[PDB]
Each structure stands twice: as C-alpha cells, then as structure tokens.
C-alpha cells in the first residue's frame, strides 16, 4: 500500500536480449545500459536530459489515484445496496 | 386478597415448554402494526 516509490520520475531504456551462459546457465547480456535507471524531480527535467544526450524518448503521463468518497455509515444503509452483509 | 408478602407469585414459568416463547410471538402477530418498507426485497436486490 505504500506510495513512496511513486513520487519521482524515472528514465529506463528498452530491454535487450539476455541469453543463457553455456557454462553455468547464468543470464548473460551484451547491453551496457540494461541496469541504467535515472531519477528526476519533474517530467521536464527528464525530457531535457534525454534530448541533451540525443536519446529518443517516450513519456508516460503520471497516473494519480482519484479522490474517493468513503463513508463508514454507508456500511449500514436503510435502502441502499452498500449495506454490508458481514463485518 | 389481604396483603400477603410471604409467597412467591412468579410460579408460571415452572411449566414453560420449549416453544413457549415462539408460541407467544405467534399470538402477537394480529396486533402488530404493518412494518415499514425499505423499497427493495433485500440489500442484494
């Protein structure tokens, strides 16, 4: 339920091939940027860094939970379907 | 009839059967006034 990991913008690159090491079966890679994650305070800061380094970027707009009306008294309603059968 | 305070007058419950309460509740059904209506058959309706 914590929301502390959804407060900063991040910049991750596309995933490249990982194969199986013939000796031990480990996960091998040839992508130097497979573990590169950058943190930005704002979307415009992230876009500025991407364009400065020449990378092509796709921006996903932030998704914020919408405010919700929560009433504990609706659990016991005279004529509504919000009455709960168990507590 | 004279004031007597030396006998237990609550002896009717010595012979109450298992259905006594429900039998009385069944007799108190023609006196009850009509119940209010929620508007639906149940909360799940």
Curated annotation (Swiss-Prot), chain A:
It comes from the Eukaryota. It is found in: Mitochondrion inner membrane. The modification Phosphoserine is found at residue 85. Residues 61-87 are annotated as: Disordered. Phosphorylated. Accessory subunit of the mitochondrial membrane respiratory chain NADH dehydrogenase (Complex I), that is believed not to be involved in catalysis. Complex I functions in the transfer of electrons from NADH to the respiratory chain. The immediate electron acceptor for the enzyme is believed to be ubiquinone. Mammalian complex I is composed of 45 different subunits. This is a component of the iron-sulfur (IP) fragment of the enzyme. Interacts with BCAP31 and TOMM40; the interaction mediates its translocation to the mitochondria; the interaction with BCAP31 is direct. Belongs to the complex I NDUFS4 subunit family. This is NADH dehydrogenase [ubiquinone] iron-sulfur protein 4, mitochondrial. The lineage of its organism: Eukaryota, Metazoa, Chordata, Craniata, Vertebrata.
Curated annotation (Swiss-Prot), chain B:
It comes from the Eukaryota. It is found in: Mitochondrion inner membrane. Its main location: mitochondrion. Keywords: Electron transport, Membrane, Mitochondrion, Mitochondrion inner membrane, Phosphoprotein, Respiratory chain, Transit peptide, Transport. The modification Phosphoserine is found at residue 42. The keyword Chloroplast does not apply. The keyword Coiled coil does not apply. GO terms for cellular component: mitochondrial inner membrane; mitochondrion; respiratory chain complex I. GO terms for biological process: mitochondrial ATP synthesis coupled electron transport. Belongs to the complex I NDUFV3 subunit family. Accessory subunit of the mitochondrial membrane respiratory chain NADH dehydrogenase (Complex I), that is believed not to be involved in catalysis. Complex I functions in the transfer of electrons from NADH to the respiratory chain. The immediate electron acceptor for the enzyme is believed to be ubiquinone. May be the terminally assembled subunit of Complex I. Complex I is composed of 45 different subunits. This is a component of the flavoprotein-sulfur (FP) fragment of the enzyme. This is NADH dehydrogenase [ubiquinone] flavoprotein 3, mitochondrial. It comes from Bos taurus (Bovine). The gene is NDUFV3. The chain holds residues 65 to 109 of 109 of the full protein.
